[PDB]
Amino acid sequence: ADDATSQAKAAFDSLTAQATEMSGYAWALVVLVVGATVGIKLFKKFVSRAS
Amino acid sequence: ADDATSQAKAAFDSLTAQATEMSGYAWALVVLVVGATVGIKLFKKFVSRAS
Amino acid sequence: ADDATSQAKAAFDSLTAQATEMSGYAWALVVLVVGATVGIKLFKKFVSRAS
Amino acid sequence: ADDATSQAKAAFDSLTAQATEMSGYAWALVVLVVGATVGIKLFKKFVSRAS
Amino acid sequence: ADDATSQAKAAFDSLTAQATEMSGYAWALVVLVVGATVGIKLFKKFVSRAS
Amino acid sequence: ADDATSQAKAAFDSLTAQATEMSGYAWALVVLVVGATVGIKLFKKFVSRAS
Amino acid sequence: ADDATSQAKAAFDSLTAQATEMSGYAWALVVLVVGATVGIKLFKKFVSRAS
Amino acid sequence: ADDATSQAKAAFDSLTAQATEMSGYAWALVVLVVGATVGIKLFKKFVSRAS
Amino acid sequence: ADDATSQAKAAFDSLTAQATEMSGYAWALVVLVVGATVGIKLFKKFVSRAS
Amino acid sequence: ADDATSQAKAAFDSLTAQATEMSGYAWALVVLVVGATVGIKLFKKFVSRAS
Amino acid sequence: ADDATSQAKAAFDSLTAQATEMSGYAWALVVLVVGATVGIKLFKKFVSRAS
Amino acid sequence: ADDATSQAKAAFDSLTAQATEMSGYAWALVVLVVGATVGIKLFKKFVSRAS
Amino acid sequence: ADDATSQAKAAFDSLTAQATEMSGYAWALVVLVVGATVGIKLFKKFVSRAS
Amino acid sequence: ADDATSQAKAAFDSLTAQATEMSGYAWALVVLVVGATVGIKLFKKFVSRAS
Amino acid sequence: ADDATSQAKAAFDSLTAQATEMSGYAWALVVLVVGATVGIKLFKKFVSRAS
């Protein structure tokens, strides 16, 4: 049934938009972990600069 | 009956085209998960580059 | 389900705020290690100044 | 019988709402396992930051 | 059955509280491994400070 | 399916152009860290020149 | 059926050529990540050269 | 019938030779995926060598 | 089962006490490597003092 | 028959208590595999600590 | 059957004692790899001590 | 199949010769980085010679 | 059938000898990657020796 | 028939001894795969030791 | 099976003796790299002695 594939198609479009919403939180979580590594690694840069 | 196999043949062609439509959504869903892994893994590349 | 993505969204916001709380302790721990390197490296500066 | 399909339809709506209730507990259980991985993996981030 | 989903719901709440109890031991085990890395990595800091 | 490989090919070209955009920010971030090392290391050059 | 293995053979040749097309994009994506590591790591080489 | 087992025996020999033909394409498909992993993993080896 | 979580809890307490016993040997091993660096680096201090 | 469901009920209670006895051995077997991973992974921690 | 669970219980006790025998060889194999890392890493310590 | 191991053997010989071709570029890339360190480090030798 | 286990035994001996032939190529492939790391890492040794 | 269970019992003892003969080849096949992982992983240990 | 653990035990003893043979080559390879660092670093000692 091609009417059957219309029901499955609309639900797969809602599930892939759910994947872009959760993946958007994955870009923002690695935003805050990379903010920790840039701050901390500049602290170690000052360690070697005064050494 | 060979007329019987004509009815079964046309319905199996509609069901295999339904499999290419749903499989097209499977290529696009793994498009958005691989966009999450390329973005996030370049975030971890900047972590090691400043380290 | 889009109601399903509302439950996952609120729990991912609590987990990313948990990442900023623990990362705040990572800035303060590298605060105290960089205080050790600035103090000690000024001790070595006095070594070369009297030499 | 189309009256037969009315009895089957109402029981399949109760069974699919049962699937959203149990699946809601599956989002919350993976909420608490992902809270374990974000906490623990920030502990390993502090390991490499002091190293 | 909605009475069936009441039995499954209460057992899934006990299983998710079991996941928070075991995950609490995972935060404490990575507490003691991170205590090893902070102690040992301050030993290596004294190595470079006297060098 | 070769039509399937056309959908995957266009999304892999967008993901590799995303890798050149993020990698461009990695060249600019190491631009500013190398500006810190050239400035600071010329400060230490003046230390030895007056010594 | 050996005619059956002729249909399966031609479709497996199209699927393995699809694997060489996607794998060609994997060589080019690691081309651009290795261009980021050669550029950035020469930036760190200039850091140690002026130090 | 032992004449019956002669008809079944010859068709099972054609089906097992069909399994060696398709399995030959499985060795060649994992040939091209392992060519992707050897190329790409030598790209990551150059990443660490210049680091 | 909450009786199941009692068996898992007692074995995780024995495994975390095993982590403090092995980590105690990690503090003592870096004790003897830091004794090598303090002795040897005072040898290099006498090198520069007579120079 | 409701007397029939009394015979089936008592045998299903003995079979579910058999499932808790065998599952108790599954918690203890993963006790000894997790003791192997905590011991061995602290061995690798000493590898990186002396490095 | 509870006699059935007696046969399964004794065989699961022999299989978990087999897991402690093989895991004992895993502690000894990581004994010899950690002996390689302590020896070799003291060789690199002498490299930096004479430098 | 031993004919199966003949197909896998010839493709593993082509993949290991691919590893010697890419590794040859790794010797030449570290040729040009070591040319940078020998040139630059002789520049610093002239710094101390005129000092 | 014990005659059945004779047919399975001889084919499992040919499959395990196939595993030693492919594993022999795995020792030789890591031969050429370790030749890249010994050559390149002696290039970095000359970098620090002239520094 | 209890004479019927004597015929079934002797054939199940021959089938379980067939399972120990084939499982003996499974211990020896994972013997040769674990010999590949111990050899190759010591090759990677020498990679990090010279690095 | 305890006879099964006898086959696995003897193969794990051969694999751990293979780890001591390869690790013996790791002590000798770091023998020759430490001979390079002792020779070269005494060359730099003569540089400062005539300065």
PDB file of N, CA and C in Angstrom, chain N residues 9-42:
ATOM      1  N   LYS N   9      18.303 -41.183  25.369  1.00  0.00           N
ATOM      2  CA  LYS N   9      19.434 -40.903  26.274  1.00  0.00           C
ATOM      3  C   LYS N   9      20.846 -41.159  25.725  1.00  0.00           C
ATOM      4  N   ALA N  10      21.119 -42.361  25.181  1.00  0.00           N
ATOM      5  CA  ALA N  10      22.383 -42.641  24.480  1.00  0.00           C
ATOM      6  C   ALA N  10      22.761 -41.784  23.268  1.00  0.00           C
ATOM      7  N   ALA N  11      21.794 -41.484  22.384  1.00  0.00           N
ATOM      8  CA  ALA N  11      21.973 -40.448  21.359  1.00  0.00           C
ATOM      9  C   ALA N  11      22.168 -38.990  21.782  1.00  0.00           C
ATOM     10  N   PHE N  12      21.502 -38.529  22.855  1.00  0.00           N
ATOM     11  CA  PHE N  12      21.849 -37.256  23.516  1.00  0.00           C
ATOM     12  C   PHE N  12      23.223 -37.153  24.214  1.00  0.00           C
ATOM     13  N   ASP N  13      23.744 -38.250  24.791  1.00  0.00           N
ATOM     14  CA  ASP N  13      25.156 -38.347  25.215  1.00  0.00           C
ATOM     15  C   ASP N  13      26.220 -38.272  24.103  1.00  0.00           C
ATOM     16  N   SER N  14      26.023 -38.968  22.966  1.00  0.00           N
ATOM     17  CA  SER N  14      26.810 -38.725  21.742  1.00  0.00           C
ATOM     18  C   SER N  14      26.745 -37.319  21.116  1.00  0.00           C
ATOM     19  N   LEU N  15      25.563 -36.685  21.081  1.00  0.00           N
ATOM     20  CA  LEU N  15      25.409 -35.273  20.679  1.00  0.00           C
ATOM     21  C   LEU N  15      26.045 -34.197  21.587  1.00  0.00           C
ATOM     22  N   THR N  16      26.011 -34.382  22.916  1.00  0.00           N
ATOM     23  CA  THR N  16      26.742 -33.527  23.875  1.00  0.00           C
ATOM     24  C   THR N  16      28.279 -33.689  23.882  1.00  0.00           C
ATOM     25  N   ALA N  17      28.813 -34.917  23.737  1.00  0.00           N
ATOM     26  CA  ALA N  17      30.222 -35.127  23.354  1.00  0.00           C
ATOM     27  C   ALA N  17      30.716 -34.565  22.009  1.00  0.00           C
ATOM     28  N   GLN N  18      29.877 -34.603  20.961  1.00  0.00           N
ATOM     29  CA  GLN N  18      30.025 -33.758  19.755  1.00  0.00           C
ATOM     30  C   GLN N  18      30.090 -32.227  19.981  1.00  0.00           C
ATOM     31  N   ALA N  19      29.231 -31.674  20.857  1.00  0.00           N
ATOM     32  CA  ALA N  19      29.373 -30.304  21.369  1.00  0.00           C
ATOM     33  C   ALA N  19      30.643 -29.915  22.133  1.00  0.00           C
ATOM     34  N   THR N  20      31.215 -30.820  22.944  1.00  0.00           N
ATOM     35  CA  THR N  20      32.568 -30.642  23.513  1.00  0.00           C
ATOM     36  C   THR N  20      33.750 -30.750  22.518  1.00  0.00           C
ATOM     37  N   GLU N  21      33.658 -31.603  21.484  1.00  0.00           N
ATOM     38  CA  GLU N  21      34.641 -31.660  20.379  1.00  0.00           C
ATOM     39  C   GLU N  21      34.706 -30.397  19.487  1.00  0.00           C
ATOM     40  N   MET N  22      33.552 -29.934  18.972  1.00  0.00           N
ATOM     41  CA  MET N  22      33.435 -28.629  18.294  1.00  0.00           C
ATOM     42  C   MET N  22      33.765 -27.390  19.140  1.00  0.00           C
ATOM     43  N   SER N  23      33.223 -27.271  20.365  1.00  0.00           N
ATOM     44  CA  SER N  23      33.714 -26.297  21.360  1.00  0.00           C
ATOM     45  C   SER N  23      35.210 -26.288  21.719  1.00  0.00           C
ATOM     46  N   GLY N  24      35.890 -27.449  21.713  1.00  0.00           N
ATOM     47  CA  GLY N  24      37.363 -27.527  21.728  1.00  0.00           C
ATOM     48  C   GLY N  24      38.125 -26.841  20.588  1.00  0.00           C
ATOM     49  N   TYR N  25      37.674 -27.036  19.339  1.00  0.00           N
ATOM     50  CA  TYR N  25      38.033 -26.137  18.221  1.00  0.00           C
ATOM     51  C   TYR N  25      37.695 -24.636  18.341  1.00  0.00           C
ATOM     52  N   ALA N  26      36.624 -24.259  19.059  1.00  0.00           N
ATOM     53  CA  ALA N  26      36.363 -22.858  19.421  1.00  0.00           C
ATOM     54  C   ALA N  26      37.308 -22.199  20.430  1.00  0.00           C
ATOM     55  N   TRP N  27      37.741 -22.934  21.473  1.00  0.00           N
ATOM     56  CA  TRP N  27      38.901 -22.541  22.292  1.00  0.00           C
ATOM     57  C   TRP N  27      40.237 -22.397  21.556  1.00  0.00           C
ATOM     58  N   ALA N  28      40.613 -23.347  20.676  1.00  0.00           N
ATOM     59  CA  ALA N  28      41.779 -23.201  19.787  1.00  0.00           C
ATOM     60  C   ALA N  28      41.786 -22.127  18.688  1.00  0.00           C
ATOM     61  N   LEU N  29      40.645 -21.881  18.022  1.00  0.00           N
ATOM     62  CA  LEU N  29      40.461 -20.709  17.139  1.00  0.00           C
ATOM     63  C   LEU N  29      40.581 -19.331  17.803  1.00  0.00           C
ATOM     64  N   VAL N  30      39.948 -19.132  18.973  1.00  0.00           N
ATOM     65  CA  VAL N  30      40.233 -17.961  19.829  1.00  0.00           C
ATOM     66  C   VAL N  30      41.620 -17.922  20.523  1.00  0.00           C
ATOM     67  N   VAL N  31      42.309 -19.065  20.696  1.00  0.00           N
ATOM     68  CA  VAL N  31      43.779 -19.131  20.901  1.00  0.00           C
ATOM     69  C   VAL N  31      44.606 -18.387  19.833  1.00  0.00           C
ATOM     70  N   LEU N  32      44.392 -18.689  18.543  1.00  0.00           N
ATOM     71  CA  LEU N  32      45.091 -18.007  17.441  1.00  0.00           C
ATOM     72  C   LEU N  32      44.722 -16.547  17.133  1.00  0.00           C
ATOM     73  N   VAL N  33      43.447 -16.150  17.304  1.00  0.00           N
ATOM     74  CA  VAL N  33      43.040 -14.723  17.323  1.00  0.00           C
ATOM     75  C   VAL N  33      43.607 -13.893  18.502  1.00  0.00           C
ATOM     76  N   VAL N  34      43.616 -14.436  19.732  1.00  0.00           N
ATOM     77  CA  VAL N  34      44.336 -13.835  20.881  1.00  0.00           C
ATOM     78  C   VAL N  34      45.876 -13.793  20.776  1.00  0.00           C
ATOM     79  N   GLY N  35      46.528 -14.774  20.127  1.00  0.00           N
ATOM     80  CA  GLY N  35      47.917 -14.637  19.651  1.00  0.00           C
ATOM     81  C   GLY N  35      48.231 -13.510  18.660  1.00  0.00           C
ATOM     82  N   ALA N  36      47.353 -13.286  17.668  1.00  0.00           N
ATOM     83  CA  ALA N  36      47.335 -12.038  16.891  1.00  0.00           C
ATOM     84  C   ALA N  36      47.179 -10.709  17.635  1.00  0.00           C
ATOM     85  N   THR N  37      46.248 -10.619  18.598  1.00  0.00           N
ATOM     86  CA  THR N  37      46.107  -9.432  19.461  1.00  0.00           C
ATOM     87  C   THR N  37      47.237  -9.159  20.476  1.00  0.00           C
ATOM     88  N   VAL N  38      47.828 -10.189  21.101  1.00  0.00           N
ATOM     89  CA  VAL N  38      49.035 -10.033  21.947  1.00  0.00           C
ATOM     90  C   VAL N  38      50.310  -9.622  21.184  1.00  0.00           C
ATOM     91  N   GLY N  39      50.623 -10.270  20.047  1.00  0.00           N
ATOM     92  CA  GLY N  39      51.686  -9.815  19.133  1.00  0.00           C
ATOM     93  C   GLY N  39      51.566  -8.395  18.570  1.00  0.00           C
ATOM     94  N   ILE N  40      50.478  -8.121  17.838  1.00  0.00           N
ATOM     95  CA  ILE N  40      50.122  -6.762  17.355  1.00  0.00           C
ATOM     96  C   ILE N  40      50.051  -5.645  18.415  1.00  0.00           C
ATOM     97  N   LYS N  41      49.400  -5.885  19.562  1.00  0.00           N
ATOM     98  CA  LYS N  41      49.387  -4.921  20.674  1.00  0.00           C
ATOM     99  C   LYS N  41      50.697  -4.633  21.412  1.00  0.00           C
ATOM    100  N   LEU N  42      51.615  -5.612  21.515  1.00  0.00           N
ATOM    101  CA  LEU N  42      53.040  -5.334  21.769  1.00  0.00           C
ATOM    102  C   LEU N  42      53.834  -4.553  20.709  1.00  0.00           C
TER     103      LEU N  42
END
